[PDB]
Design an enzyme around this catalytic site. Structure first.
Site, PDB file in Angstrom:
ATOM      1  N   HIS A  78       0.807  -1.223   0.000  1.00 21.88           N
ATOM      2  CA  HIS A  78       0.000   0.000   0.000  1.00 21.88           C
ATOM      3  C   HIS A  78       0.846   1.282   0.000  1.00 21.88           C
ATOM      4  CE1 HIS A  78       0.185   1.159   4.260  1.00 21.88           C
ATOM      5  NE2 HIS A  78      -0.306  -0.009   4.674  1.00 21.88           N
ATOM      6  N   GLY A  95       2.171   5.935  10.441  1.00 19.09           N
ATOM      7  CA  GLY A  95       3.597   5.824  10.138  1.00 19.09           C
ATOM      8  C   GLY A  95       4.225   4.516  10.603  1.00 19.09           C
ATOM      9  N   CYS A 136       3.216   1.475   9.715  1.00 21.30           N
ATOM     10  CA  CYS A 136       3.126   0.407   8.717  1.00 21.30           C
ATOM     11  C   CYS A 136       4.494  -0.099   8.316  1.00 21.30           C
ATOM     12  CB  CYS A 136       2.328   0.855   7.505  1.00 21.30           C
ATOM     13  SG  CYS A 136       0.642   1.370   7.914  1.00 21.30           S
TER      14      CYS A 136
END
Ligand SMILES: CO[C@@]1(C(=O)Nc2cncc3ccccc23)CCOc2cc(Cl)c(Cl)cc21
Ligand SMILES: CO[C@@]1(C(=O)Nc2cncc3ccccc23)CCOc2cc(Cl)c(Cl)cc21
Ligand SMILES: [Cl-]
Lengths: 305, 305
Positions: free
Chosen positions: A41, A143, A145
């Site tokens: 993503h 942030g 991820c």
């Protein structure tokens, strides 16, 4: 003595964390040898997340669109490919700090350590379990991820989780390192929710054995039960069914304490039916289910890495 | 979202752990530059512990009596000195993995991460607090002596604790890295016992602010309290007095959530009176006191839900 929610030492994983930037998105990547793994993503925009054909979004990217930073050093991306929901960025430098590792997919009930990172910099480490509903009750902000979950066996890091999203109830969802989601989640912006969760019975029993080893025995009783009667009560209290495999896995703890697994089940049944009556077990007023039998044996034996 | 007992990433400390052996005793040492720091009781037998004369025991030792092992490499001890209850072994090799560090002595209520080690090998990492009675509720087995506690705000490790002993109640006592014990404890087998412990009030308030930031307000009430009335009530539940310093330190959390410190004190007074009535706060059925105001600000979002 003592019993804490203990994580594995994170040094071997800290040496793999990098920052991946694509457009306006910055997240974390895992740099192992010459590949940086991160959530696919990262190629997405706010609009792109609604209907993301990840093959179509990715074909429009070149290697130089991915900015990878390891400490104060920029790595150059020389290739890119997608494996399920993970993006693999081939870089021109092999990570000299790459530990001995494996990618493993864990089962619900299994625990792991999470090294929470922001901007490729490790912020903290904590221990958690893969819930029966495939979410994790993590502590993650925007942030985070690309932060990973892992276990260590001897000198080998077994990476088992990569963070992708937070669900509306504040719990988290992610994939294994092969990019397969845990649970029925997708990395597309659509209505998603954690399903009804249950308590990991074998882990609660393991933690009751840990309490007995540490001298907390008030909940023990003279009674035993059968597996079927116990499971009838477990179903009633949203506890996962206890299998003969769970009974076998608790064998060593049963032998050490002298409390048969079904003897401990009769204690657990009484705790579910009557509560703790103002008492605590290992400093908790709730029955703890994020320690596996292996975690209990390891913490009460001092295994090192 | 989420709130976990989060430890600092332990890599910088893992690279400092060594094994120190003197006679039949093996424990952990902290190797920083060319010095290995460890508990001075490494030179003691169990009989010596009743009334040890460390100066007399140490004068009888030569440098080559201390065996220091870092990984699979023996370090050579070229000097030794005692500073309070810590032994400082000068070695012929500076630790190339020495991080940027400081020795800091902490106050009760402060938290820190513990990297539990055995035979110079890290086993796990967990979060601890210095209790008001100067003990720590650690998870340590025999052989864990010399394991250290630390914080890593920025890229600098602040070492604040070195493990020396387990007290009869199963809690732990140790020193700062200058070898000064926390509390009235001594590295002598005396009838010393942990004094009556109390709850770290400022930390419970910080954790209630964490719960508000994460989206929960059920425990708030329409009341306020004077600081003196709050302290009169709190002491009846074995809570530490709340000082004006604690009120000042909670200022930023008060500004972020819009809940005045003394209004949060009123909520805590009511929780102490009523209990949780089957509810939880941040996944706990007990009031948590091992998160400081600083830890809450570090972990929680800067935007209240
Ligand atoms: C791009 O990441 C998102 C996200 O969940 N991130 C987060 C992950 N962890 C903690 C968070 C705390 C607060 C805010 C966001 C968090 C943003 C929301 O929409 C989505 C939607 C999807 Cl399908 C995916 Cl796979 C990711 C995201
Ligand atoms: C030499 O260490 C001792 C110790 O406490 N060790 C331990 C430290 N941590 C966890 C433990 C778990 C179980 C067994 C011992 C533990 C042994 C007992 O007597 C003493 C007495 C003194 Cl005054 C000192 Cl400073 C150390 C020791
Ligand atoms: Cl302090």
């Amino acid at each position: 003595s003592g019993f804490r929610k203990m994580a594995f030492p994170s040094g071997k994983v800290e040496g793999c964390m990098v920052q991946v930037t694509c457009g306006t998105t910055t997240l974390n990547g895992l740099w192992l040898d010459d590949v940086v793994y991160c959530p696919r993503h990262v190629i997405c925009t706010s609009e792109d997340m609604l209907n993301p054909n990840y093959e179509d979004l990715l074909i429009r990217k070149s290697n130089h669109n991915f900015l990878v930073q390891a400490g104060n050093v920029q790595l150059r991306v020389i290739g890119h490919s997608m494996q399920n929901c993970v993006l693999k960025l081939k870089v021109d430098t092999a990570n000299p700090k790459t530990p001995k590792y494996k990618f493993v997919r864990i089962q619900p009930g299994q625990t792991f350590s999470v090294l929470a990172c922001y901007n490729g910099s490790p912020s903290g480490v904590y221990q958690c379990a893969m819930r029966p509903n495939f979410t994790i009750k993590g502590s993650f902000l925007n942030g985070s991820c690309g932060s990973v979950g892992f276990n260590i066996d001897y000198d080998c890091v077994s990476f088992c989780y990569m963070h992708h999203m937070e669900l509306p109830t504040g719990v988290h969802a992610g994939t294994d390192l092969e990019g397969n989601f845990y649970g029925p989640f997708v990395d597309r912006q659509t209505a998603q929710a954690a399903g009804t969760d249950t308590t990991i019975t074998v882990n609660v029993l393991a933690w009751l054995y840990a309490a007995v080893i540490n001298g907390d025995r008030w909940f023990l009783n003279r009674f035993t039960t059968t597996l079927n009667d116990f499971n009838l009560v477990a179903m009633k209290y949203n506890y996962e069914p206890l299998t003969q495999d769970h009974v076998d896995i608790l064998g060593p703890l049963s032998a050490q304490t002298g409390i048969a697994v079904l003897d401990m089940c009769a204690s657990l049944k009484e705790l579910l039916q009557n509560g703790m009556n103002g008492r605590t077990i290992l400093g908790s007023a709730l029955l703890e289910d994020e320690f596996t039998p292996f975690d209990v044996v390891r913490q009460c034996s001092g295994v090192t890495f």
